[PDB]
PDB file of C-alpha atoms in Angstrom:
ATOM      1  CA  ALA A   1     117.067  63.131 -83.900  1.00  0.00           C
ATOM      2  CA  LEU A   2     114.319  65.635 -83.255  1.00  0.00           C
ATOM      3  CA  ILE A   3     113.739  67.365 -79.952  1.00  0.00           C
ATOM      4  CA  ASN A   4     110.424  69.138 -79.447  1.00  0.00           C
ATOM      5  CA  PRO A   5     109.774  71.975 -77.007  1.00  0.00           C
ATOM      6  CA  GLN A   6     107.915  71.974 -74.778  1.00  0.00           C
ATOM      7  CA  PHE A   7     107.907  68.265 -74.779  1.00  0.00           C
ATOM      8  CA  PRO A   8     111.547  67.776 -74.642  1.00  0.00           C
ATOM      9  CA  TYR A   9     113.349  64.439 -74.811  1.00  0.00           C
ATOM     10  CA  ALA A  10     114.675  63.615 -71.311  1.00  0.00           C
ATOM     11  CA  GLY A  11     118.219  64.845 -71.170  1.00  0.00           C
ATOM     12  CA  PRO A  12     119.533  61.432 -70.404  1.00  0.00           C
ATOM     13  CA  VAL A  13     118.474  58.025 -69.142  1.00  0.00           C
ATOM     14  CA  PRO A  14     118.936  58.960 -65.516  1.00  0.00           C
ATOM     15  CA  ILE A  15     119.801  57.444 -62.182  1.00  0.00           C
ATOM     16  CA  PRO A  16     116.723  55.308 -61.646  1.00  0.00           C
ATOM     17  CA  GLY A  17     118.166  52.587 -63.801  1.00  0.00           C
ATOM     18  CA  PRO A  18     118.089  48.930 -62.316  1.00  0.00           C
ATOM     19  CA  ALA A  19     121.607  47.437 -62.244  1.00  0.00           C
ATOM     20  CA  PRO A  20     120.629  43.843 -62.725  1.00  0.00           C
ATOM     21  CA  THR A  21     123.727  41.897 -62.237  1.00  0.00           C
ATOM     22  CA  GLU A  22     127.446  41.856 -61.491  1.00  0.00           C
ATOM     23  CA  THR A  23     128.002  39.004 -63.972  1.00  0.00           C
ATOM     24  CA  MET A  24     130.345  40.816 -66.125  1.00  0.00           C
ATOM     25  CA  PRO A  25     133.260  38.615 -65.760  1.00  0.00           C
ATOM     26  CA  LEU A  26     134.848  36.503 -68.321  1.00  0.00           C
ATOM     27  CA  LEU A  27     137.196  34.215 -66.525  1.00  0.00           C
ATOM     28  CA  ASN A  28     140.498  34.009 -68.479  1.00  0.00           C
ATOM     29  CA  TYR A  29     141.142  30.611 -69.819  1.00  0.00           C
ATOM     30  CA  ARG A  30     144.329  28.926 -68.793  1.00  0.00           C
ATOM     31  CA  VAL A  31     145.281  25.664 -70.748  1.00  0.00           C
ATOM     32  CA  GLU A  32     148.111  23.279 -71.877  1.00  0.00           C
ATOM     33  CA  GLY A  33     147.523  21.500 -75.193  1.00  0.00           C
ATOM     34  CA  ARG A  34     149.481  18.522 -76.464  1.00  0.00           C
ATOM     35  CA  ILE A  35     148.871  16.783 -79.886  1.00  0.00           C
ATOM     36  CA  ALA A  36     151.630  14.057 -79.757  1.00  0.00           C
ATOM     37  CA  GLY A  37     150.874  10.724 -81.306  1.00  0.00           C
ATOM     38  CA  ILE A  38     153.686   8.939 -83.084  1.00  0.00           C
ATOM     39  CA  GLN A  39     153.794   9.952 -86.776  1.00  0.00           C
ATOM     40  CA  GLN A  40     154.871   7.232 -89.377  1.00  0.00           C
ATOM     41  CA  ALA A  41     156.608   8.522 -92.504  1.00  0.00           C
ATOM     42  CA  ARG A  42     154.345   7.277 -95.259  1.00  0.00           C
ATOM     43  CA  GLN A  43     150.749   7.229 -96.592  1.00  0.00           C
ATOM     44  CA  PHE A  44     149.398   4.851 -99.087  1.00  0.00           C
ATOM     45  CA  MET A  45     147.652   6.065-102.298  1.00  0.00           C
ATOM     46  CA  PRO A  46     146.449   4.563-105.482  1.00  0.00           C
ATOM     47  CA  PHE A  47     148.613   6.808-107.455  1.00  0.00           C
ATOM     48  CA  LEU A  48     150.430   9.950-106.831  1.00  0.00           C
ATOM     49  CA  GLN A  49     152.823  11.768-109.169  1.00  0.00           C
ATOM     50  CA  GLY A  50     152.139   9.947-112.452  1.00  0.00           C
ATOM     51  CA  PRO A  51     151.462  11.688-115.758  1.00  0.00           C
ATOM     52  CA  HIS A  52     149.739   8.896-117.551  1.00  0.00           C
ATOM     53  CA  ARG A  53     149.891   8.450-121.289  1.00  0.00           C
ATOM     54  CA  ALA A  54     146.683   9.498-123.102  1.00  0.00           C
ATOM     55  CA  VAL A  55     147.935   7.848-126.289  1.00  0.00           C
ATOM     56  CA  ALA A  56     151.239   6.341-126.919  1.00  0.00           C
ATOM     57  CA  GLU A  57     153.061   6.576-130.190  1.00  0.00           C
ATOM     58  CA  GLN A  58     153.520   3.494-132.194  1.00  0.00           C
ATOM     59  CA  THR A  59     156.850   1.802-131.175  1.00  0.00           C
ATOM     60  CA  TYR A  60     158.935  -0.969-132.841  1.00  0.00           C
ATOM     61  CA  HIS A  61     162.086  -3.183-133.013  1.00  0.00           C
ATOM     62  CA  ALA A  62     164.008  -4.052-136.229  1.00  0.00           C
ATOM     63  CA  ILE A  63     165.600  -6.910-138.129  1.00  0.00           C
ATOM     64  CA  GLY A  64     166.942  -7.765-141.530  1.00  0.00           C
ATOM     65  CA  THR A  65     168.696 -10.577-142.845  1.00  0.00           C
ATOM     66  CA  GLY A  66     169.668 -12.468-145.815  1.00  0.00           C
ATOM     67  CA  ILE A  67     171.803 -12.770-148.805  1.00  0.00           C
ATOM     68  CA  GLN A  68     172.072 -11.504-152.390  1.00  0.00           C
ATOM     69  CA  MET A  69     170.879 -14.223-154.686  1.00  0.00           C
ATOM     70  CA  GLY A  70     169.196 -14.197-158.147  1.00  0.00           C
ATOM     71  CA  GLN A  71     167.780 -16.090-161.254  1.00  0.00           C
ATOM     72  CA  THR A  72     167.894 -13.764-164.421  1.00  0.00           C
ATOM     73  CA  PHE A  73     166.717 -13.735-168.073  1.00  0.00           C
ATOM     74  CA  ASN A  74     168.287 -11.099-170.482  1.00  0.00           C
ATOM     75  CA  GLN A  75     167.086  -9.312-173.688  1.00  0.00           C
ATOM     76  CA  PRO A  76     168.409 -10.685-176.904  1.00  0.00           C
ATOM     77  CA  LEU A  77     171.120  -9.066-178.946  1.00  0.00           C
ATOM     78  CA  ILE A  78     169.923  -6.496-181.608  1.00  0.00           C
ATOM     79  CA  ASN A  79     171.414  -4.835-184.702  1.00  0.00           C
ATOM     80  CA  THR A  80     173.059  -1.577-183.797  1.00  0.00           C
ATOM     81  CA  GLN A  81     171.548   1.356-185.626  1.00  0.00           C
ATOM     82  CA  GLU A  82     174.062   4.143-185.951  1.00  0.00           C
ATOM     83  CA  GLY A  83     177.405   5.309-184.645  1.00  0.00           C
TER      84      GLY A  83
ATOM     85  CA  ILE B   1     150.131  21.037 -93.691  1.00  0.00           C
ATOM     86  CA  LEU B   2     147.651  20.825 -90.802  1.00  0.00           C
ATOM     87  CA  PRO B   3     145.035  23.164 -89.253  1.00  0.00           C
ATOM     88  CA  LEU B   4     146.501  23.250 -85.738  1.00  0.00           C
ATOM     89  CA  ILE B   5     143.552  24.998 -84.095  1.00  0.00           C
ATOM     90  CA  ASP B   6     141.050  22.615 -85.749  1.00  0.00           C
ATOM     91  CA  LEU B   7     142.944  19.520 -84.546  1.00  0.00           C
ATOM     92  CA  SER B   8     143.444  20.728 -80.964  1.00  0.00           C
ATOM     93  CA  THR B   9     139.806  21.678 -80.449  1.00  0.00           C
ATOM     94  CA  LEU B  10     137.219  19.181 -79.224  1.00  0.00           C
ATOM     95  CA  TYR B  11     133.749  19.173 -80.778  1.00  0.00           C
ATOM     96  CA  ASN B  12     131.625  17.177 -78.318  1.00  0.00           C
ATOM     97  CA  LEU B  13     128.071  16.195 -77.450  1.00  0.00           C
ATOM     98  CA  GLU B  14     127.125  15.468 -73.822  1.00  0.00           C
ATOM     99  CA  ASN B  15     123.907  15.230 -71.863  1.00  0.00           C
ATOM    100  CA  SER B  16     122.805  15.453 -68.235  1.00  0.00           C
ATOM    101  CA  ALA B  17     119.655  15.451 -66.120  1.00  0.00           C
ATOM    102  CA  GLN B  18     118.418  18.312 -63.957  1.00  0.00           C
ATOM    103  CA  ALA B  19     115.610  18.169 -61.388  1.00  0.00           C
ATOM    104  CA  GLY B  20     113.893  20.643 -59.065  1.00  0.00           C
ATOM    105  CA  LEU B  21     111.014  22.016 -61.138  1.00  0.00           C
ATOM    106  CA  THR B  22     107.991  23.672 -59.529  1.00  0.00           C
ATOM    107  CA  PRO B  23     104.933  25.267 -61.218  1.00  0.00           C
ATOM    108  CA  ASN B  24     105.230  28.850 -62.458  1.00  0.00           C
ATOM    109  CA  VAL B  25     108.784  29.203 -61.225  1.00  0.00           C
ATOM    110  CA  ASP B  26     111.748  29.745 -63.544  1.00  0.00           C
ATOM    111  CA  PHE B  27     113.864  26.599 -63.680  1.00  0.00           C
ATOM    112  CA  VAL B  28     117.329  27.745 -64.721  1.00  0.00           C
ATOM    113  CA  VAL B  29     120.068  25.431 -66.017  1.00  0.00           C
ATOM    114  CA  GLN B  30     123.341  27.357 -66.000  1.00  0.00           C
ATOM    115  CA  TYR B  31     125.740  26.870 -68.892  1.00  0.00           C
ATOM    116  CA  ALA B  32     128.920  25.258 -67.510  1.00  0.00           C
ATOM    117  CA  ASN B  33     131.205  28.079 -68.525  1.00  0.00           C
ATOM    118  CA  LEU B  34     134.328  28.089 -70.886  1.00  0.00           C
ATOM    119  CA  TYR B  35     132.642  25.809 -73.460  1.00  0.00           C
ATOM    120  CA  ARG B  36     131.332  27.374 -76.663  1.00  0.00           C
ATOM    121  CA  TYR B  37     127.795  25.936 -76.789  1.00  0.00           C
ATOM    122  CA  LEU B  38     126.561  25.536 -80.372  1.00  0.00           C
ATOM    123  CA  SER B  39     123.174  24.003 -79.526  1.00  0.00           C
ATOM    124  CA  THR B  40     121.037  23.007 -76.580  1.00  0.00           C
ATOM    125  CA  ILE B  41     118.335  20.376 -76.410  1.00  0.00           C
ATOM    126  CA  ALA B  42     115.997  20.237 -73.422  1.00  0.00           C
ATOM    127  CA  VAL B  43     113.690  17.261 -72.942  1.00  0.00           C
ATOM    128  CA  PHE B  44     110.917  17.779 -70.421  1.00  0.00           C
ATOM    129  CA  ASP B  45     110.454  14.299 -68.993  1.00  0.00           C
ATOM    130  CA  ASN B  46     107.452  15.239 -66.879  1.00  0.00           C
ATOM    131  CA  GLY B  47     107.439  12.137 -64.698  1.00  0.00           C
ATOM    132  CA  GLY B  48     107.232   9.819 -67.686  1.00  0.00           C
ATOM    133  CA  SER B  49     104.799  12.064 -69.515  1.00  0.00           C
ATOM    134  CA  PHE B  50     105.929  13.868 -72.668  1.00  0.00           C
TER     135      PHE B  50
END
């Protein structure tokens, strides 16, 4: 702010002001609020809580069976070298 | 987990008609107090002329 003498800035907005209204009042709000609809315990989703496999491992079962059977052919006898 | 204020507040649209207009005089439609008015639309149906 600058004040300049001799033209000085009025020393106030004075008493000639026009009170325009008495509408100043905010009427307090008084209220009762009830949000009470029956609630049912459940919601349907496509899927909740699953941690789906991105790849599975290979998996398997097992079997064996049979017996011990055989047809054989042997090497001929040979002269013994030494000993 | 619910926003209690959100769910107990009403967001509404309503309309009404006001008459009593006269040339060069301020026609004032008072806001019906307590509501929080987000927007106002005023249609001047000038006797069927728009």
